[PDB]
Design a protein around this ligand. Structure first.
Ligand SMILES: Cc1cc2nc3c(=O)[nH]c(=O)nc-3n(C[C@H](O)[C@H](O)[C@H](O)COP(=O)(O)OP(=O)(O)OC[C@H]3O[C@@H](n4cnc5c(N)ncnc54)[C@H](O)[C@@H]3O)c2cc1C
Lengths: 663, 131, 9
């Protein structure tokens, strides 16, 4: 993304120097043919994208495209038309909110019902309407945006749903942010921790625990990919299981290390013992031999030569033994030095202290927040399967509130709010969607359409007994995917005060939980809003449990933790408080998808696959597909995100248009 | 391939995962092994304290002053008789025999053996030392 | 997913 044309390819999540699978399908003549024609194709594509991206507030037409192409790229008018049409159809250009050069024809082809007015639903609806289809969105809630929900009272603004743009580098919300007035503000990465008591973690310790966390994660990846530790007792290995195992092996090594150290101390002590014994025996033989010499020397001259020899021989023998003992006394000295050195440099007493395991649990809580699930549920092998598609650049927050995006997308769309879909019927001839008014449930509605786009959250599709009945029932391959896949939970506590008592230069600050069981409970506080608002996350096992506890108690536990960090005099009572309960929300049944143990990226593709009904009269030709699926749980490469939802909508609009208007 | 500061043996992984309590079992086995090695230290270092006590004073009371006698060439009858007795006690150890006499190099002692072999029946004297 | 992690290494 250094060049201008190459930068557009990157911003559109396309390889600038190669044709994609989708391109091979729509341009088989080109990709199967000479290299020169492919390079021409790739430039026309890359350039068209550049033009759209440079000004995404107005429709890029085919004519406007052909104008600004230099030869020999503008030579082939049909190739330029095919490229433009492909890009428009698949929502790579002329997506979001742009001024249209030519008004849409009042004559509409085909009828589509879209279930849900979330970003996936709205993204699809806009595309389909702009392709000249008749679109109606059915929405259970009294509002649009779905899991994008912004709280508003006076000047107070706080997202209870999606909050963060995870970088603009390759992000389609980059285009939407130019089209819609979003106040995008960078998140300052500095995040001080504060232990149970309210004391900031010592800098050196903080750095040590964090480094151990990242090593523990990398270890699970090694455990997974290198040692192939992915099944245990005919059950898929959790990330939690792998972390437990990796920790236990680190605790084992600490003990194994101590043993080897003490084992070489006893081996030196048993050398010293064997020496000291030899020196004690030799001292007795020296003592005895000295007496014998003393007695022989006491015999005064004159004496015969045998008496002289006895004095001399004993003197010789005593000097020889006094040499041995002095050599052993040296050997004793160096073994005593070695022993004092081993006692001075012992190995680690413990792998992790009680406080270190507590601070480490915060990093696990952070990971449980990110995946919106207990680490015991995450697939070790595939929890991070979308890593290669992550965007580049600083993460940003929406200061004016994320709702600004769906509300903007909803302009000019036929949206039935307070309309809860109960039954989806799909046959060879078409579809009936049976909904009710959420207020008076007896007021029944029937919508007849050529196609149904289902953007129901995975939480709703999972609900047993079902909130929505499919007739005929969804195939085993679809329902198995729904059952297998993870749908997580993550809650937010909005605290609105009259004055700022926290560090305005710090956007993020954590609280370390007392125990492992409570590590997710109000583990993080967010300060990214203009007004004095603090947003507390409830992650991990804590999320599900804290939904069965009153807002007062939760606001209670919040103030307690803040008092601990800032002191009782600094923390006032909050003016306004909100507590999200996403698992209990019957139009969500959770926060967003995770790759559950026993699932993979492949299930996200199964979720995206449309249903084709059986024939009406039998021996009748294979019907066309009727029931289509979009939403964050349908996009393998960008799951559990707003950009994922948006991209999933654009994808299904193109698949539906291709089907019912022709490619 | 594992990260620095992490130890992950295939063998170790199998042993920890083999059972649900295998890990907590393997860790107590090492805790007991560590106590057993730590008490074996206390024992053998208190044993070594007792021996260091029995050697208190060294061998300074039994140390004999050093003789610095100048090496001489002429064999006195005294020196010849000392040598013959030294041969009988110390066998063929020429250094020891030289030490006893105290004014004959290892060379002169080595010569002496060949010179006087006949006159002092050194063959017989060595046979007597061997038996 | 990973993307949402705070204090990313
Ligand atoms: C707490 C939280 C924080 C998040 N943070 C981020 C973040 O920082 N960044 C990010 O990119 N993503 C984030 N996400 C994820 C993001 O909100 C979703 O991935 C995305 O909004 C999903 O859009 P969707 O259209 O797939 O589903 P939804 O937005 O849920 O849309 C589905 C719609 O279907 C409707 N519906 C349900 N049942 C029925 C029915 N029976 N009949 C009719 N309509 C029905 C719902 O009311 C809803 O409007 C977060 C999610 C949560 C919960």
């Amino acid at each position: 993304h250094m060049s201008g044309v190459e930068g557009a390819a990157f911003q559109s999540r396309l390889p600038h120097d190669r044709m994609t699978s989708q391109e091979a399908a729509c341009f088989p003549d080109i990709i199967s043919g000479p290299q020169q024609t492919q390079k021409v194709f790739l430039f026309i594509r890359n350039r068209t994208l550049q033009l759209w991206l440079d000004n995404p507030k107005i429709q890029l037409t085919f004519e406007a495209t052909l104008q600004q192409l230099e030869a020999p790229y503008n030579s082939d008018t049909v190739l330029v038309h095919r490229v433009h049409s492909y890009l428009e159809r698949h929502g790579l250009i002329n997506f979001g909110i742009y001024k249209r050069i030519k008004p849409l024809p009042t004559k509409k082809t085909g009828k589509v019902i879209i279930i849900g007015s979330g970003v996936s639903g709205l993204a699809a609806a806009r595309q389909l309407q702009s392709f000249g289809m008749d679109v109606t969105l059915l929405e259970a809630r009294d509002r649009v945006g779905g899991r994008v929900a912004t709280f508003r009272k006076g000047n107070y603004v706080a997202d209870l749903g999606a909050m963060v743009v995870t970088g603009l580098g390759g992000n389609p919300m980059a285009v939407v942010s130019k089209q819609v007035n979003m106040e995008l503000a960078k998140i300052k990465q500095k995040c001080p921790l504060y232990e149970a008591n309210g004391q900031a973690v010592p800098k050196e310790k903080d750095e040590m625990v964090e480094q151990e966390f990242n090593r523990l994660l990398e270890a699970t990846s090694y455990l997974s990919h290198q040692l192939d530790f992915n099944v245990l007792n005919n059950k898929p290995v959790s990330l939690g299981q792998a972390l437990e195992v990796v920790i236990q092996l680190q605790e084992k090594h600490v003990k194994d290390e101590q043993i080897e150290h003490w084992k070489k101390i006893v081996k030196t002590q048993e050398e010293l013992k064997e020496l000291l014994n030899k020196m004690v025996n030799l001292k007795e033989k020296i003592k005895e031999l000295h007496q014998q010499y003393k007695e022989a020397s006491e015999v005064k001259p004159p004496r015969d030569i045998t008496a002289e020899f006895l004095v001399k021989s004993k003197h010789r023998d005593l000097t020889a033994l006094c040499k041995e003992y002095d050599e052993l006394a040296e050997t004793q000295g160096k073994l005593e030095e070695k022993l004092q050195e081993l006692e001075a440099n012992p190995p680690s007493d413990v792998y992790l202290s009680s406080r270190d395991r507590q601070i480490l649990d915060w990093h696990f809580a952070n990971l449980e927040f990110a995946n919106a699930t207990p680490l015991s549920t995450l697939s070790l092998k595939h929890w991070d399967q979308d890593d290669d598609f992550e965007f580049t650049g600083s993460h940003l927050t929406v200061r004016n509130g994320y709702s600004c995006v769906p509300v903007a997308l909803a302009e000019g769309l036929d949206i039935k709010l307070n309309t809860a879909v109960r039954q989806v019927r799909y046959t060879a001839s078409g579809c009936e969607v049976i909904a009710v008014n959420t207020r008076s449930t007896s007021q029944t509605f029937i919508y007849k359409c050529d196609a149904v786009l289902c953007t129901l959250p995975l939480g709703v599709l999972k609900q047993q007994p079902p909130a929505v009945q499919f007739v005929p029932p969804l195939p085993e391959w679809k329902t198995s995917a729904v059952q297998r896949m993870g749908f997580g939970n993550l809650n937010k506590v909005v605290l609105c005060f009259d004055r700022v008592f926290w560090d305005p230069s710090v956007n993020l600050f954590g609280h370390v939980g007392s125990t492992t069981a409570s590590r997710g409970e109000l583990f993080l506080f967010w300060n990214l809003y203009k007004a004095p608002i603090l947003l507390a996350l409830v992650a991990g096992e804590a999320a599900g449990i804290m939904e069965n506890i009153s807002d007062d108690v939760i606001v209670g536990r919040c103030l307690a933790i803040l008092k601990g960090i800032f002191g009782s005099s600094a923390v006032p009572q909050p003016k306004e408080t909100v507590v999200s309960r996403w698992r209990a929300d019957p139009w969500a049944r959770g926060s967003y998808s995770y790759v559950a143990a026993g699932s993979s990226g492949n299930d996200y593709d199964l979720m995206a696959q449309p249903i084709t009904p059986g024939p009406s009269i039998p021996g009748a030709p294979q019907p066309i597909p009727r029931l289509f699926f979009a939403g964050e749980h349908t996009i393998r490469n960008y799951p559990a995100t707003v950009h994922g939802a948006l991209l999933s909508g654009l994808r299904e609009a193109g698949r539906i248009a291709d089907q019912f208007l022709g490619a | 391939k594992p990260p620095k500061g992490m130890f992950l043996s295939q063998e170790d992984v199998e042993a920890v995962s083999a059972n649900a309590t295998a890990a907590t079992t393997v860790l107590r086995q090492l805790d007991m092994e560590l106590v057993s090695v730590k008490r074996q230290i206390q024992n053998i270092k208190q044993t070594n304290s007792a021996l260091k006590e029995k050697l208190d004073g060294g061998i300074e009371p039994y140390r004999l002053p050093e003789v610095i006698q100048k090496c001489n060439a002429r064999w006195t009858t005294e020196e010849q008789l000392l040598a013959v007795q030294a041969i009988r006690k110390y066998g063929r150890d020429f250094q020891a025999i030289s030490d006893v006499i105290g004014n004959k190099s290892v060379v002169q002692v080595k010569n002496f053996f060949v010179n006087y072999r006949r006159r002092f029946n050194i063959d017989e004297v060595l046979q007597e030392w061997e038996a | 997913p990973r993307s949402f992690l705070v204090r990313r290494k």
